[PDB]
From Swiss-Prot, chain C:
The chain holds residues 183 to 379 of 380 of the full protein. Only component of antiviral defense system Shedu. Expression of Shedu in B.subtilis (strain BEST7003) confers resistance to phages phi105, phi29, rho14 and to a lesser extent to SPP1. May be an endonuclease. This is Shedu protein SduA.
Length: 185, 202, 186, 202
């Protein structure tokens, strides 16, 4: 119950600034599928990797629409160390490259959907995800690393101009988990 | 930790009653006022679903599922008073028997959004603009004597049961996934996540 | 030159309130490919219908090969519903909303069947200069002049700014660029 | 008739003059000021390319390719004075040698945007916010004594000649097409449409 929710936070806090392996955070969200389900207002269910043979695929159980989620490490920089202009900071190449990569996978997944769908038919797997819209999510970095107001302003501009990619930092992801505790109390 | 178990039961008990009314009058009772009242009393559910501590329903504001009483009676006055609620979610609750797509076909395999559904999306944006100007008007007066809210908009109308076709569901998704600042979630989708919360708590 | 530009407006000014056939407006834009190329700041070139096979045009950037799908309706296509949802609130007409859904559906199909389309061009010997990299769509329908009341314009502006990947452009706005080009030169 | 032919020749002569400058030192001159000066004396070209009669380069405003003489020296003053010029396109002109993507690969087939390119995109957005803030500042003062400009942003930098692979071109497109209020057009793309205008006229 709620003790399970607190356990997730304890795991999150313990490796908040130490773990730098994408595989570990892959497991944590895979073990607790409800964590990523809180991002989307519409209901979502996890899709097994075999169905579409460090990303996750969540699909709406009603419309079968699928959303692709890419998970990086919390230590991923959000902005460049130096500043392009006084008070203007460029988004780090790690963040910009991550956004591009998830779009490429979404393009590839839709372009090869017929091959994947037919393979599931042969193997008996029931395909429950339909690529209707190019919605992607990139979970990376921590918002707390942005100290200066210029840093927060520069990063906020980057994450507001994106059309179909929602960049969510790790701390914001677990704030929904932590926020659930407060609402229950 | 014992109270945490008590909180778990209290949270589940509230969720069961919300599903109880939904699974009892989702077909007969179709008045907008009734469904607004039900979701008002269970605002804490909406806070988690839309990932926003502060929500705006009708002419009232609820923070963390708590009714924030405002003596002035103006939603804008509360929003200006508290800078925290500058990213609140505006929710318009319609009847669950609201058509989502036109019964006929615009083309082969394409269904256009129904009048009622796209009317609500226009209405909430109109309501959002009015709140923005009233907030701006107060800011001008305070400056005269001596920002912009930009709240999120969410429309809750219709059920996914009426979409009894792949074309019906695909057309609806292409509509609601194209809006920038409006999220359309059906009543069936709304209460199915309520079931998910029960499963997570249990 | 300029005389050519004024000739195009003569056709537009003559058929904007008379011609209600979708095929005719396809012919006009197909004859003058430069008209639709003025919508996009980046260079674009029209792709023949044989290459990638409702009126639909396909323009591709000559450099990055990115393709854009444009759907053309009639100028007589309503933009908003005749009645009002609420007092001062008008809904977008089903013709406009349905047109947006259809162009997105065709864009989805075009990307999904790209491998077959690319392979067919290889067999037929045709080159494939278009690539579906981004889901960008354009819908051309109706005229902005038909929105007389300030509520009508506000209701339509809310809808068109709300869209993510579809840019609804009325006919008069499209041909205003043609008229705008004349004034800049003159 | 006679006037049209004279205007057609003037337009073609102007367009060919710009191409002569572009094709004479696109590989030698890297001064950002130089390319700002060249592209601001031919603003009528930019008006048609970006489909906007009003163009804002640096702190100077151009309407229909004509230099507006604002004696105040503040760009916002002109914008507030003239309600017509509210959707003006803000254009930032960089050197054509500006890199577009990182020379190394982020992954297998994925390239991230270069620091200079993404730095300019943030800079114009910062410039846009300052103009919006100053526009309100004037508007607030007028109210005390007795809306929102929300313009567009365009960045012109780099050449497509650097992108010598399919992966490079796909990566660049996935970046600029994802932006909402910023349009990125390379110098090679900018003058390609200049050639297209000549073909249309001639």
């Amino acid at each position: 119950g709620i003790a399970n929710l607190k356990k997730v936070l304890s795991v999150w806090e313990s490796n908040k600034l130490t773990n730098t392996s994408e595989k570990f955070w892959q497991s944590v969200l895979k073990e607790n599928t409800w964590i990523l389900s809180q991002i989307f207002s519409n209901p979502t269910v996890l899709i097994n990797d075999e169905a579409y043979v460090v990303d996750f695929l969540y699909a709406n159980p009603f419309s079968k629409d699928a959303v692709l989620i890419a998970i990086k490490t919390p230590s991923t920089p959000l902005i460049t160390p130096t500043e392009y202009r006084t008070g203007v900071y460029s988004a780090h190449k790690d963040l910009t490259g991550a956004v591009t990569q998830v779009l490429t996978y979404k393009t590839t997944l839709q372009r090869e959907y017929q091959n994947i769908d037919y393979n599931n038919y042969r193997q008996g797997i029931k395909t429950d995800f339909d690529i209707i819209t190019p919605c992607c999510v990139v979970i990376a970095g921590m918002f707390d690393t942005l100290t200066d107001t210029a840093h927060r302003h520069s990063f906020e501009l980057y994450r507001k101009e994106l059309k179909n990619v929602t960049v969510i930092t790790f701390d914001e992801l677990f704030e929904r988990v932590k926020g659930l505790i407060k609402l229950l109390e």
